[PDB]
Amino acid sequence: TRKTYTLTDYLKNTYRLKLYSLRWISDHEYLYKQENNILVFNAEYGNSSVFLENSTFDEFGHSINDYSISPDGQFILLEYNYVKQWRHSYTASYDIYDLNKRQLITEERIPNNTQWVTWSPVGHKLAYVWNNDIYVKIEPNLPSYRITWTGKEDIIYNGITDWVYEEEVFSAYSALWWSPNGTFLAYAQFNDTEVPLIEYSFYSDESLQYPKTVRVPYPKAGAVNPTVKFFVVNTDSLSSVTNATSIQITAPASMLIGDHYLCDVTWATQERISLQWLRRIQNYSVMDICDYDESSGRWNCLVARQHIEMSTTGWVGRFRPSEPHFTLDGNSFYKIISNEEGYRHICYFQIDKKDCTFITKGTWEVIGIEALTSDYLYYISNEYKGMPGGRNLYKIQLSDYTKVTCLSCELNPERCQYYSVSFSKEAKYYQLRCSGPGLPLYTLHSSVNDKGLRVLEDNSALDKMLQNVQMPSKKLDFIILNETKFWYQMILPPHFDKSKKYPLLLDVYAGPCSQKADTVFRLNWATYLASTENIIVASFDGRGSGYQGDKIMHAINRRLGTFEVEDQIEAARQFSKMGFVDNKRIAIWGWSYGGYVTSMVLGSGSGVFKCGIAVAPVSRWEYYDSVYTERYMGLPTPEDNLDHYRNSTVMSRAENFKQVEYLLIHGTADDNVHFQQSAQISKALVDVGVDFQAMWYTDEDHGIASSTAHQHIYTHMSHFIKQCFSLP
Amino acid sequence: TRKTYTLTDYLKNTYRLKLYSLRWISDHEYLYKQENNILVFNAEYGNSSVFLENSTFDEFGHSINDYSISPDGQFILLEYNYVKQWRHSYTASYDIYDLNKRQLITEERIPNNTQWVTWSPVGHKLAYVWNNDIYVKIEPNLPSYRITWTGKEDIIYNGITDWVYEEEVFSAYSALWWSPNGTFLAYAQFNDTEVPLIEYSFYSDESLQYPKTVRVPYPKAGAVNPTVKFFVVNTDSLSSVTNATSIQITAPASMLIGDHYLCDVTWATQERISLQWLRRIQNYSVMDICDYDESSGRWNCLVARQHIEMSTTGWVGRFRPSEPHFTLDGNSFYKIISNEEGYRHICYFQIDKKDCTFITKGTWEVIGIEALTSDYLYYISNEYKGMPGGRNLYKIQLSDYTKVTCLSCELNPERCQYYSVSFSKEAKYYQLRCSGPGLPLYTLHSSVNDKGLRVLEDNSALDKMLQNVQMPSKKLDFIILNETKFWYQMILPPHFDKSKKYPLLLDVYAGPCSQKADTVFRLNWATYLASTENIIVASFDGRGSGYQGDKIMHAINRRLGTFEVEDQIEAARQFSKMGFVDNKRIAIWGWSYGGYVTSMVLGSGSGVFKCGIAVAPVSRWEYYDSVYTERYMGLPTPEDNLDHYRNSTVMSRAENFKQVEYLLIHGTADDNVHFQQSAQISKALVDVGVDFQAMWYTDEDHGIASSTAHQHIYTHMSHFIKQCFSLP
Ligand SMILES: *[C@@H]1O[C@H](CO)[C@@H](O[C@@H]2O[C@H](CO)[C@@H](O)[C@H](O)[C@H]2NC(C)=O)[C@H](O)[C@H]1NC(C)=O
Ligand SMILES: *[C@@H]1O[C@H](CO)[C@@H](O[C@@H]2O[C@H](CO)[C@@H](O)[C@H](O)[C@H]2NC(C)=O)[C@H](O)[C@H]1NC(C)=O
Ligand SMILES: *[C@@H]1O[C@H](CO)[C@@H](O[C@@H]2O[C@H](CO)[C@@H](O)[C@H](O)[C@H]2NC(C)=O)[C@H](O)[C@H]1NC(C)=O
Ligand SMILES: *[C@@H]1O[C@H](CO)[C@@H](O[C@@H]2O[C@H](CO)[C@@H](O)[C@H](O)[C@H]2NC(C)=O)[C@H](O)[C@H]1NC(C)=O
Ligand SMILES: *[C@@H]1O[C@H](CO)[C@@H](O[C@@H]2O[C@H](CO)[C@@H](O)[C@H](O)[C@H]2NC(C)=O)[C@H](O)[C@H]1NC(C)=O
Ligand SMILES: *[C@@H]1O[C@H](CO)[C@@H](O[C@@H]2O[C@H](CO)[C@@H](O)[C@H](O)[C@H]2NC(C)=O)[C@H](O)[C@H]1NC(C)=O
Ligand SMILES: *[C@@H]1O[C@H](CO)[C@@H](O[C@@H]2O[C@H](CO)[C@@H](O)[C@H](O)[C@H]2NC(C)=O)[C@H](O)[C@H]1NC(C)=O
Ligand SMILES: N[C@H]1C[C@@H](N2Cc3nn4cccnc4c3C2)CO[C@@H]1c1cc(F)ccc1F
Ligand SMILES: N[C@H]1C[C@@H](N2Cc3nn4cccnc4c3C2)CO[C@@H]1c1cc(F)ccc1F
Ligand SMILES: *[C@@H]1O[C@H](CO)[C@@H](O)[C@H](O)[C@H]1NC(C)=O
Ligand SMILES: *[C@@H]1O[C@H](CO)[C@@H](O)[C@H](O)[C@H]1NC(C)=O
Ligand SMILES: *[C@@H]1O[C@H](CO)[C@@H](O)[C@H](O)[C@H]1NC(C)=O
Ligand SMILES: *[C@@H]1O[C@H](CO)[C@@H](O)[C@H](O)[C@H]1NC(C)=O
Ligand code: NA
């Protein structure tokens, strides 16, 4: 008999997916690493040369974590001494290498403890942030110009985000934005003076005698938020004036009446910038479009160019208002917004007209706009076959909206139903990346004729390996509840037999705009559970889930911990009725939001689930951060939504855990969902006399992603599931 | 078919030991609390009167925690609003009730949040500490005189101890000592300015949005220690208009040359005080004897009255240098010290002579001196039947040391082998307290002819209830290692059948001077495990254990985590070869020091133990406090004992946990053994890929003693042991 996909296979990566990560450096060349050499490829013909020999930095004396070539090709920025901070942020050292002199720059180096660095989009200017202030270098070997003087650790952040803006607003650490040709540098400044601190212990190596207390400005729901200001500096003036003026652009009056956020910054032209602002009550946003006034040196935002985006049924955007994509002249833009039926589609705006024109429509959604040329807009959607969990690339003719071509749908329809794309600098070529349901496939295409040029990586080596393995299958389908389709997937054991009763594990996330039923190919823990342990691993996208319109997504508005929890319970009941599930052996697990839902389900008293595992769960919404929580829950005040905040805790359900086996797991240095959240769950369970299993992971954060802890946690959870299901 | 002693019996206190806690108020009367009344008893005849009616405080408006009657009987101090701090420390509110005029005192009340209060030993003066400063009240209704003005939270402590002096030196929060008639008040002042702080999170009620960070001055091994000064104030010459003058008594030069401690304060007469000082290297101590000089108003300690106590094989004293017991005139004293054979015996000293005379001798030890008259000294020892785990009361004729009479040995030798005693004011009467091997027995005696006056409490009610329960028995015996006998006990299941094989749990503590093999009767977790689950629960006293001389106790000097760990393995090895032990089911558990030993044993690679449980273990001596750790280990410096600090950690043994099942448990608010210690164990186990079981207890301290956590931990451990032993 062929072997199975075992736990050790998962944990040791024996069966590896190959990727093809390229970096476009122009409209027709890309960089690609191969055998630690950086090669440069010609896209049209597929030929290559060595861009940088892998021997180049043998004598560097440090392992180089990443590199970044200046847009003009003249320099390479070398990143080393890399230390992770939060999801996106990190600390590192940097050196610059002159590619023409084939020489390292030893003068006026980027300092130690630099927080962020970026090249200008053209040429080779650098902007970096060090000790919370912005610096610009016009040339890599010359002195820096200081841009801000207010930077203060944990208090004032210039050009980088604080914790909550990084995690919840920008999905990025950087808070600066070069203008398209590099003349201007726009940046945000955050003031956390009165934001309360989360404090937790970090134990470090065993040599550390006293634990360190980590202290981070972190606004929990309803707490004082960071305030924000926006500035633009002319970097071309730096070498001519002693201290160049940062010109502030103020938020509109409709935002200044209360707490608000800066949520998007997008340059439209060399002298026009768009800013979107969001009210703390996140159902109202405003875009200003601001023009540089050459005679006054100021930036002015005409109210005739201001665009309002609001929601009557929920919050604005999927996780925030969408970004605009400006036409070359900057006088019009395209933006994904929810149409009158609640489906997200592409709308076309003139900058000084308030009514836009939808250029796509239907009962499906546009996921993202990927490229815009003078003649075509390229976008990704889930239109194809009415499958919300598929993704394909489309092209729409700007002179005639009835001409829409699917570029990816029929390329390999059995193997490939989930695409992303990477366009060259002026969209002359594109790389398609298919990620399922078959093995991933990376291909290169020419935009002039939409012809396939070549296969970049087809994963045939892996395909060969998997031939000798009893792999599970995946089923993606829907059930109908109240005349609405709700999608599910199942990872099914090899030789699945519909006449047998299998144990079922419900793998849950179920956060707002989540999607756990899709066409993506994964090699993960579920692969082992199905393949080796003969467990069915199911996931369900119920109310609150994304990419299916606002009626579904906004069903949980102001009501987290209700329908999305109920719909997972109902999903399990529906799976029992399918006839191949052992009703005595249904379990549930999740991480993060999934841990909250899992815990809520286990505490519901439904009687459906024998056991479950919550990893780093939210337990009480007042413990989680303001920006995410309030987006869905409003404010925890008597005037707003306090009663539901208080009604949706895990702790209030502690008595019902007497009916289940529960394993609670949390990293002690989780900066995101504080260990506090599980500390309060455990205390509530202790207080009502409920036995349960627990595991803390010393100095692990929300990812529990260190190599040893990752292997440990999946090993511990595997034991627990097997015990619950009486598997030897 | 009668019941067993169940887990719920242990957790719910079904079978209660009755006490007889009295408080002597004179040579012939004592107070006893009965049905919320306070009675006064006549010792000679056993008749009583009501001293204070329960009903007196019916409309008090607060729950009264405790009471303290002034020595002259005129006043009662009422303690309420009790808030626990560490092992001994707490704050509370106090009111004083006048017993003669039958009224609460409303003038000049003791403030809220008072840290310590005590009556003078004669009359009804009060001293109290509030906000770290000392106050004295001459009369309950009159204003306090402020004695100290330097008190500062976490920095300067007047009249109360800091964390480490409380836990490790004085076993008390108070650092006030009244002279015998109340004229003088001596006190210590602690200065923790440069002592580092342990910091840890406290989660509190679910309502608390942000966790609190608790910060406590706590010197870990080798860290900066608190400094100490000692003062005496005359309370008879206090003034309303002038600040009180405190006279300092400075430590001897032999102490002032480096770090040191104040370790004992004992008044000898109305005008003579003795102080003992201990070097930070705790093998050298000095007693000063200081006399009040009425013409200078100063305290002088003559060098000819200094007494040095040192140890060549270890540290001084069992846990600290022993207390002196002065004669009526204060010109001589008796003190327990280690003799030339290493056995602790009573030495008689003249205050101005260097050599003392031992008045007892032999291969057994004196446990404590209990009372002293002009004709007799009364002490407790383990001499009887050469059993180190038994305790009896003796008297020795001071005119003829060959005349020693056992006063408790033969009273009831089958029921009673472990005594303590409480003498009346001038030793005219004594209460004997038998705590095993039978049910506790409380009796009253008169010293003149050692008459056994009456039985105060015989627990005949409990005896009656226990007749209908299948109770375990206790075997106390010894094994011979390298020609030394070492004692053990086994809690044996009911109907013990030596032809059957029982699983065995080794219950371990094994700290320096510990004794876990004794004749004490206990109703505890082991009782349930033996009675209901048929597990033998054994304990063993090996090298490092107490009450058997320094050759045994000092064997672990400078070497914690060696012989005491080895000796537990050897005992289990020997138990495993007895015909009634199943060698496939041997487990080990312990708490605190016992958790360290358990962990070290399970990490030894001995293969003897299937599983074990460590509750709040020490894992690395550098993490524990200076005073305890350094007593046994010296300083963690390269020139002292650093190498041994470094190879005595649990973490270094992680790989050896591969072949055992381990459950690790720790309270997150443990101020004593910081959660840090277990956090480092878990990380080390994770790092070598060893699976284990864990449980944290939110906001529990070293005792894990709140009602709900206590029930939960023993429930969780019981499941673990039963699973390990395949018991239903
Ligand atoms: C891929 O091949 C092309 C064409 O052969 C190379 O482009 C140049 O071709 C000219 C012919 O006029 C040669 O003289 C040079 O060798 C090439 N110049 C440069 C700057 O590349 C091209 O080099 C190849 N691309 C890569 C990345 O190697
Ligand atoms: C960040 O915000 C704080 C307000 O929270 C500002 O601090 C105030 O500044 C004024 C001076 O203009 C002082 O008079 C106030 O006392 C300060 N308030 C507090 C609460 O500290 C601070 O100026 C801001 N910093 C920047 C660079 O904008
Ligand atoms: C460059 O200009 C900025 C803005 O005018 C200066 O920042 C001010 O500095 C002064 C005193 O050092 C403060 O009182 C102001 O509150 C600051 N304003 C801002 C916006 O930061 C900065 O100090 C100047 N740098 C130099 C070298 O002159
Ligand atoms: C980048 O764009 C900027 C902004 O339009 C250009 O700067 C202007 O250049 C024109 C010259 O044609 C001048 O009249 C203006 O005074 C400049 N304005 C400012 C604010 O600097 C700039 O020339 C462009 N840079 C490059 C390299 O093409
Ligand atoms: C308690 O101890 C500290 C020393 O730790 C004494 O404080 C001062 O020590 C600093 C070092 O922190 C020196 O600057 C001074 O010499 C010390 N003070 C003085 C006045 O010299 C502190 O004074 C002590 N406090 C008490 C009340 O005894
Ligand atoms: C407590 O003992 C003290 C100290 O011996 C006594 O105080 C002395 O009393 C006599 C009066 O007979 C004076 O001559 C001394 O000057 C006192 N000494 C001091 C230091 O005050 C005191 O009498 C005793 N107190 C009681 C209540 O008996
Ligand atoms: C108290 O203990 C210390 C530590 O064991 C003894 O220290 C001496 O100094 C170092 C150890 O730190 C060694 O080099 C010496 O050999 C130690 N002396 C010995 C072994 O005699 C110190 O001697 C002890 N004090 C007493 C009174 O015994
Ligand atoms: N902090 C959130 C961010 C959330 N989003 C995913 C995502 N996809 N996406 C696409 C475009 C823009 N933004 C986003 C986000 C941000 C994922 O859950 C996180 C989270 C939620 C909890 F309740 C608890 C812990 C968490 F880590
Ligand atoms: N801090 C010590 C104190 C020690 N006690 C002191 C003391 N004085 N004393 C007088 C007569 C009889 N017994 C004692 C003891 C026992 C008990 O262990 C405690 C302990 C040891 C650890 F390794 C870890 C945590 C602990 F809490
Ligand atoms: C924004 O939300 C609040 C609370 O739900 C509501 O009162 C307000 O009307 C909303 N705004 C819009 C535009 O619907
Ligand atoms: C007990 O009895 C004696 C003698 O009868 C009596 O005078 C004395 O006051 C009594 N003591 C108490 C405390 O009742
Ligand atoms: C103790 O606190 C209570 C409650 O505020 C207050 O009424 C009382 O005056 C306080 N007692 C003293 C002695 O200050
Ligand atoms: C007593 O000492 C304190 C603190 O040094 C001072 O403030 C106070 O005024 C003094 N009182 C008298 C009466 O000297
Ligand atoms: Na009698």
mmCIF file of N, CA, C and O in Angstrom, chain A residues 199 204 206 209-210 213 215 218 220-221 622-623 676 679-680 682-683 690-691 694 696 698 708 712 716, chain B residues 199 204 206 209-210 213 215 218 220-221 620 622-623 676 679-680 682-683 690-691 694 696 698 712 716:
data_model
loop_
_atom_site.group_PDB
_atom_site.id
_atom_site.type_symbol
_atom_site.label_atom_id
_atom_site.label_comp_id
_atom_site.label_asym_id
_atom_site.label_seq_id
_atom_site.Cartn_x
_atom_site.Cartn_y
_atom_site.Cartn_z
ATOM 1 N N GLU A 199 0.366 45.779 28.603
ATOM 2 C CA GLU A 199 1.609 45.373 29.238
ATOM 3 C C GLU A 199 1.595 43.853 29.443
ATOM 4 O O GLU A 199 0.621 43.316 29.924
ATOM 5 N N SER A 204 12.229 35.767 27.443
ATOM 6 C CA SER A 204 13.476 35.753 26.704
ATOM 7 C C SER A 204 14.271 34.470 26.961
ATOM 8 O O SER A 204 13.740 33.487 27.480
ATOM 9 N N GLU A 206 16.883 31.859 28.694
ATOM 10 C CA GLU A 206 16.858 31.466 30.102
ATOM 11 C C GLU A 206 17.880 32.296 30.930
ATOM 12 O O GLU A 206 17.721 32.473 32.140
ATOM 13 N N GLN A 209 17.519 37.168 33.906
ATOM 14 C CA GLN A 209 17.145 36.911 35.307
ATOM 15 C C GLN A 209 15.784 37.467 35.675
ATOM 16 O O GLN A 209 15.016 36.788 36.352
ATOM 17 N N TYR A 210 15.476 38.688 35.236
ATOM 18 C CA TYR A 210 14.158 39.278 35.448
ATOM 19 C C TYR A 210 13.419 39.364 34.122
ATOM 20 O O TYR A 210 13.989 39.838 33.148
ATOM 21 N N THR A 213 9.028 43.628 30.825
ATOM 22 C CA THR A 213 7.630 43.991 30.595
ATOM 23 C C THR A 213 7.555 44.745 29.257
ATOM 24 O O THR A 213 8.197 45.790 29.080
ATOM 25 N N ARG A 215 5.493 46.918 26.631
ATOM 26 C CA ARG A 215 4.480 47.954 26.782
ATOM 27 C C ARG A 215 4.215 48.563 25.417
ATOM 28 O O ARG A 215 5.123 49.131 24.819
ATOM 29 N N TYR A 218 -1.993 50.557 22.567
ATOM 30 C CA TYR A 218 -2.976 49.667 21.994
ATOM 31 C C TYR A 218 -4.326 50.094 22.526
ATOM 32 O O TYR A 218 -4.622 49.884 23.722
ATOM 33 N N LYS A 220 -7.989 49.470 23.128
ATOM 34 C CA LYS A 220 -9.045 48.465 23.178
ATOM 35 C C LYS A 220 -10.384 49.160 22.877
ATOM 36 O O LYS A 220 -10.454 50.407 22.823
ATOM 37 N N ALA A 221 -11.422 48.370 22.621
ATOM 38 C CA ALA A 221 -12.704 48.925 22.198
ATOM 39 C C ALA A 221 -13.189 50.041 23.124
ATOM 40 O O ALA A 221 -13.258 49.875 24.344
ATOM 41 N N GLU A 622 -14.554 43.851 24.261
ATOM 42 C CA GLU A 622 -13.888 44.969 24.927
ATOM 43 C C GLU A 622 -12.380 44.753 25.145
ATOM 44 O O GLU A 622 -11.681 45.718 25.411
ATOM 45 N N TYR A 623 -11.884 43.519 25.029
ATOM 46 C CA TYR A 623 -10.427 43.273 25.101
ATOM 47 C C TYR A 623 -9.680 43.464 23.764
ATOM 48 O O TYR A 623 -8.428 43.589 23.749
ATOM 49 N N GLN A 676 -4.385 37.744 28.144
ATOM 50 C CA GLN A 676 -5.569 38.144 28.929
ATOM 51 C C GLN A 676 -6.878 37.466 28.508
ATOM 52 O O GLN A 676 -7.693 37.064 29.351
ATOM 53 N N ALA A 679 -6.733 33.991 29.576
ATOM 54 C CA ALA A 679 -6.654 34.041 31.046
ATOM 55 C C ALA A 679 -8.035 34.216 31.665
ATOM 56 O O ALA A 679 -8.333 33.634 32.700
ATOM 57 N N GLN A 680 -8.888 35.009 31.033
ATOM 58 C CA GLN A 680 -10.240 35.192 31.547
ATOM 59 C C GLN A 680 -11.147 34.003 31.235
ATOM 60 O O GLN A 680 -11.982 33.656 32.058
ATOM 61 N N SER A 682 -10.143 30.791 31.118
ATOM 62 C CA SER A 682 -9.740 29.755 32.065
ATOM 63 C C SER A 682 -10.274 30.049 33.461
ATOM 64 O O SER A 682 -10.720 29.127 34.139
ATOM 65 N N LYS A 683 -10.216 31.312 33.875
ATOM 66 C CA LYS A 683 -10.691 31.693 35.200
ATOM 67 C C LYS A 683 -12.203 31.489 35.346
ATOM 68 O O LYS A 683 -12.658 31.012 36.392
ATOM 69 N N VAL A 690 -15.381 23.519 35.804
ATOM 70 C CA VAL A 690 -15.260 22.797 34.561
ATOM 71 C C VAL A 690 -13.823 22.365 34.328
ATOM 72 O O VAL A 690 -12.924 23.198 34.323
ATOM 73 N N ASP A 691 -13.608 21.071 34.122
ATOM 74 C CA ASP A 691 -12.292 20.594 33.723
ATOM 75 C C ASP A 691 -12.054 20.787 32.232
ATOM 76 O O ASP A 691 -12.957 20.643 31.423
ATOM 77 N N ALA A 694 -5.244 22.694 28.713
ATOM 78 C CA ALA A 694 -4.679 23.990 28.446
ATOM 79 C C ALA A 694 -3.239 23.857 28.020
ATOM 80 O O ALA A 694 -2.557 22.901 28.390
ATOM 81 N N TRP A 696 -0.013 26.913 27.308
ATOM 82 C CA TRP A 696 0.553 28.218 26.990
ATOM 83 C C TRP A 696 1.823 27.980 26.187
ATOM 84 O O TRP A 696 2.455 26.912 26.324
ATOM 85 N N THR A 698 5.340 29.888 25.677
ATOM 86 C CA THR A 698 6.194 30.946 26.190
ATOM 87 C C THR A 698 6.822 31.747 25.057
ATOM 88 O O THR A 698 7.423 31.171 24.148
ATOM 89 N N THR A 708 9.894 25.486 16.377
ATOM 90 C CA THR A 708 9.662 24.474 17.413
ATOM 91 C C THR A 708 8.242 24.529 17.978
ATOM 92 O O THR A 708 7.619 23.489 18.221
ATOM 93 N N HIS A 712 5.262 21.749 17.917
ATOM 94 C CA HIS A 712 4.746 21.355 19.218
ATOM 95 C C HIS A 712 3.234 21.467 19.294
ATOM 96 O O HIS A 712 2.570 20.559 19.764
ATOM 97 N N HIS A 716 0.544 18.470 19.767
ATOM 98 C CA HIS A 716 -0.332 18.442 20.939
ATOM 99 C C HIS A 716 -1.793 18.361 20.534
ATOM 100 O O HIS A 716 -2.561 17.575 21.108
ATOM 101 N N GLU B 199 8.057 41.964 37.881
ATOM 102 C CA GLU B 199 6.848 42.520 37.280
ATOM 103 C C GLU B 199 6.051 41.386 36.661
ATOM 104 O O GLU B 199 6.622 40.527 36.016
ATOM 105 N N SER B 204 -7.465 40.290 37.037
ATOM 106 C CA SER B 204 -8.576 40.793 37.835
ATOM 107 C C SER B 204 -9.906 40.317 37.269
ATOM 108 O O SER B 204 -9.958 39.363 36.492
ATOM 109 N N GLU B 206 -13.322 40.164 35.097
ATOM 110 C CA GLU B 206 -13.558 40.258 33.662
ATOM 111 C C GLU B 206 -13.796 41.699 33.230
ATOM 112 O O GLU B 206 -13.443 42.093 32.119
ATOM 113 N N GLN B 209 -10.632 46.158 31.718
ATOM 114 C CA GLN B 209 -10.313 46.169 30.288
ATOM 115 C C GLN B 209 -8.823 45.936 30.003
ATOM 116 O O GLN B 209 -8.482 45.215 29.079
ATOM 117 N N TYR B 210 -7.951 46.560 30.787
ATOM 118 C CA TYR B 210 -6.511 46.377 30.650
ATOM 119 C C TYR B 210 -5.913 45.684 31.889
ATOM 120 O O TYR B 210 -6.120 46.147 33.006
ATOM 121 N N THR B 213 -0.164 45.604 35.912
ATOM 122 C CA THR B 213 1.178 45.081 36.084
ATOM 123 C C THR B 213 1.536 45.267 37.558
ATOM 124 O O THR B 213 1.516 46.385 38.074
ATOM 125 N N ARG B 215 4.223 45.196 40.506
ATOM 126 C CA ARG B 215 5.663 45.382 40.602
ATOM 127 C C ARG B 215 6.087 45.256 42.056
ATOM 128 O O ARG B 215 5.561 45.962 42.904
ATOM 129 N N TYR B 218 12.065 42.609 44.772
ATOM 130 C CA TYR B 218 12.356 41.200 44.972
ATOM 131 C C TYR B 218 13.776 40.954 44.463
ATOM 132 O O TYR B 218 14.004 40.992 43.266
ATOM 133 N N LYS B 220 16.491 38.650 43.284
ATOM 134 C CA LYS B 220 16.816 37.287 42.851
ATOM 135 C C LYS B 220 18.279 37.000 43.235
ATOM 136 O O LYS B 220 18.983 37.901 43.695
ATOM 137 N N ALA B 221 18.728 35.762 43.100
ATOM 138 C CA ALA B 221 20.064 35.371 43.592
ATOM 139 C C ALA B 221 21.178 36.237 42.989
ATOM 140 O O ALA B 221 21.239 36.434 41.754
ATOM 141 N N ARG B 620 15.338 27.197 38.034
ATOM 142 C CA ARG B 620 16.693 27.706 37.912
ATOM 143 C C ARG B 620 16.934 28.625 39.111
ATOM 144 O O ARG B 620 16.148 29.532 39.358
ATOM 145 N N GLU B 622 18.943 30.949 39.928
ATOM 146 C CA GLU B 622 19.076 32.378 39.657
ATOM 147 C C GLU B 622 17.732 33.117 39.581
ATOM 148 O O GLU B 622 17.697 34.337 39.675
ATOM 149 N N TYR B 623 16.632 32.400 39.428
ATOM 150 C CA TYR B 623 15.311 33.027 39.379
ATOM 151 C C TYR B 623 14.671 33.190 40.755
ATOM 152 O O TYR B 623 13.691 33.932 40.882
ATOM 153 N N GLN B 676 7.495 32.892 35.369
ATOM 154 C CA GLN B 676 8.779 32.786 34.679
ATOM 155 C C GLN B 676 9.445 31.401 34.780
ATOM 156 O O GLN B 676 9.907 30.848 33.776
ATOM 157 N N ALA B 679 7.527 29.025 32.794
ATOM 158 C CA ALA B 679 7.583 29.506 31.396
ATOM 159 C C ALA B 679 8.895 29.099 30.719
ATOM 160 O O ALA B 679 8.906 28.771 29.524
ATOM 161 N N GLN B 680 9.994 29.108 31.473
ATOM 162 C CA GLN B 680 11.260 28.651 30.919
ATOM 163 C C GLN B 680 11.324 27.104 30.754
ATOM 164 O O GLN B 680 11.923 26.601 29.791
ATOM 165 N N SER B 682 8.691 25.066 30.060
ATOM 166 C CA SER B 682 7.862 24.775 28.893
ATOM 167 C C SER B 682 8.596 25.110 27.582
ATOM 168 O O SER B 682 8.608 24.308 26.644
ATOM 169 N N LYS B 683 9.251 26.263 27.532
ATOM 170 C CA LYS B 683 9.990 26.655 26.335
ATOM 171 C C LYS B 683 11.142 25.678 26.013
ATOM 172 O O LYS B 683 11.372 25.356 24.848
ATOM 173 N N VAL B 690 9.516 17.779 23.053
ATOM 174 C CA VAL B 690 8.894 16.882 24.019
ATOM 175 C C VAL B 690 7.463 17.341 24.300
ATOM 176 O O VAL B 690 7.262 18.509 24.609
ATOM 177 N N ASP B 691 6.484 16.431 24.172
ATOM 178 C CA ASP B 691 5.096 16.747 24.471
ATOM 179 C C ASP B 691 4.905 16.615 25.977
ATOM 180 O O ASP B 691 5.569 15.796 26.629
ATOM 181 N N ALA B 694 -0.034 20.832 30.505
ATOM 182 C CA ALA B 694 0.155 22.070 31.256
ATOM 183 C C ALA B 694 -1.146 22.605 31.749
ATOM 184 O O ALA B 694 -2.204 22.314 31.197
ATOM 185 N N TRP B 696 -2.177 26.595 33.538
ATOM 186 C CA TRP B 696 -1.918 27.846 34.261
ATOM 187 C C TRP B 696 -3.157 28.134 35.087
ATOM 188 O O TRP B 696 -4.249 27.715 34.707
ATOM 189 N N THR B 698 -5.042 31.429 36.379
ATOM 190 C CA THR B 698 -5.126 32.873 36.293
ATOM 191 C C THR B 698 -5.296 33.527 37.665
ATOM 192 O O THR B 698 -6.233 33.178 38.401
ATOM 193 N N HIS B 712 -10.173 22.767 41.482
ATOM 194 C CA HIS B 712 -9.837 22.505 40.088
ATOM 195 C C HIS B 712 -8.487 21.814 39.917
ATOM 196 O O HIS B 712 -8.367 20.892 39.110
ATOM 197 N N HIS B 716 -7.927 18.131 38.416
ATOM 198 C CA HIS B 716 -7.102 17.949 37.199
ATOM 199 C C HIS B 716 -5.940 16.948 37.421
ATOM 200 O O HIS B 716 -5.668 16.069 36.579
#
